[PDB]
Design a protein around this ligand. Structure first.
Ligand SMILES: [Cu+2]
Ligand SMILES: [Cu+2]
Length: 407
């Protein structure tokens, strides 16, 4: 599977009837959609027609280290009118995404994000799917860009996005079936906003995976909090036709789901997603240390106490890990705010905690850590060397809420 790709500085009509001076991954930004079979070292040549350097981070995604879009011993930072060969095996089925790991506030903020369907090689029980690609843009009322870094907004829960965009569309008109189940690849791809999601309106609705990394089929539920660098592969039995089902964030009119007609029979409930083969950790055998949290210009958002810029580029060994050995992490949120703690490279299972309490443990690349929460996450050092790891509230990362570890 061998592929193209512009980083095209695209003027596109974002604000209905207006400008917008943006940097897309080709067209239809948030990015162009990626489909690969679960296998082929996915061949791609990145392209820059933009004025400055940019990687491509394969979020969650557990590639050969070099490839992870991660500056300096992994890959050094690709330039304007230049390319790097992007090539990697695809282990983690279901929705992942892509986006830089450079000056990212600005970069992603200007549209540098996009999805990554990873076609489960098992014939998807779902007849029909769809992609529902969430960002909310740092744009003023005229389309021109609001700042991406905002100190007192960002030193609390993150810098303010504004415009509500699925596939880059405010008020989405995604058209659907009379009777069939539908796969609902929902991707939070925002910088900063942590989205509090529900369904009102008349329909049946079930989930299958989360953050690509599947599990059993839990349904409709309370408002499931979705974080930056989180996703949710999920299903909807839209009823018999008509109903424009209200997609919401708590109350908030996000998108709309026109139930359109079909001369066709029902695509009744698929049996559970066959979970991803992952760093399956041994329970009693692992060991443990911990941290996150605190509050001198640049982030004052301290990391198990370790500034970050001595840690700028090389490594003051912020953690020291061994290959193939199973392992465990306590996480304390210490500042009066909430952080979506992400990982590359590997993807992890969760065990037990405070805020939510644990029925079936779940795989994901990113854990969504609440205030004073102390959650037991666990995996094994599957992939090698220096992997990156950090508060995916992009701003919280940017200048000093990042840290990392090797194998
Ligand atoms: Cu990542
Ligand atoms: Cu954060």
């Amino acid at each position: 599977h061998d592929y193209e790709l512009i980083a095209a500085p695209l003027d596109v009509e974002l604000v209905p009837g207006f400008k917008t001076e943006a940097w897309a991954f080709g067209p239809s930004a948030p990015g162009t959609e990626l489909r690969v079979r679960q296998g082929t070292w996915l061949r791609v040549r990145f392209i820059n027609h933009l004025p400055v350097e940019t990687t491509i981070h394969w979020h969650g995604i557990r590639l050969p280290l070099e490839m992870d879009g991660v500056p300096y011993v992994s890959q050094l930072p690709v330039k304007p009118g230049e390319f790097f060969d992007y090539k990697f095996r695809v282990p983690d089925a279901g929705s992942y995404w892509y986006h830089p790991h450079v000056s990212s506030s600005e970069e992603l903020g200007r549209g540098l994000v996009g999805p990554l369907i990873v076609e489960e090689r098992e014939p998807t029980g779902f007849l029909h799917e769809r992609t529902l690609s969430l960002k909310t843009w740092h744009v003023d009322e005229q389309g021109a860009f609001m700042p991406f870094s905002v100190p007192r907004e960002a030193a609390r829960n993150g810098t303010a996005g504004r415009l509500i965009t699925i596939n880059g569309q405010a008020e989405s008109v995604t058209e659907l079936p009379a009777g069939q189940v539908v796969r609902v690849r929902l991707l939070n791809l925002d910088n900063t906003w942590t989205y509090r999601i529900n369904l009102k309106g008349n329909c049946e609705a079930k989930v299958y995976a989360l953050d690509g990394n599947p599990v059993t089929p839990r349904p409709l539920e309370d408002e499931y909090w979705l974080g930056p660098g989180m996703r949710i592969c999920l299903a909807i039995r839209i009823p018999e036709a008509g109903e424009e089902i209200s997609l919401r964030d708590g109350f908030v009119r996000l998108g709309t789901l026109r139930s359109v007609a079909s001369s066709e029979a029902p695509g009744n409930w698929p049996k559970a997603l066959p979970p991803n083969p992952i760093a399956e950790p041994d329970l009693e055998k692992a060991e443990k240390l911990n941290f996150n949290f605190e509050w001198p210009p640049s982030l004052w958002q301290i990391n198990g106490q370790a500034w970050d810029i001595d840690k700028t580029c090389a490594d003051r060994p912020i953690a020291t890990l061994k290959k193939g050995k199973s392992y465990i992490f306590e996480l304390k949120n210490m500042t009066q705010y909430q952080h979506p703690i992400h990982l590359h490279g590997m993807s992890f299972k969760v065990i037990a905690s405070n805020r939510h309490k644990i029925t079936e443990p779940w795989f994901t690349d990113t854990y969504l850590l609440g205030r004073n929460e102390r959650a037991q996450v666990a995996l094994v050092a599957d992939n090698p060397g220096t992997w990156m790891f950090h508060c995916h509230v992009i701003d919280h990362m940017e200048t000093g809420l990042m840290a990392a570890i090797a194998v």
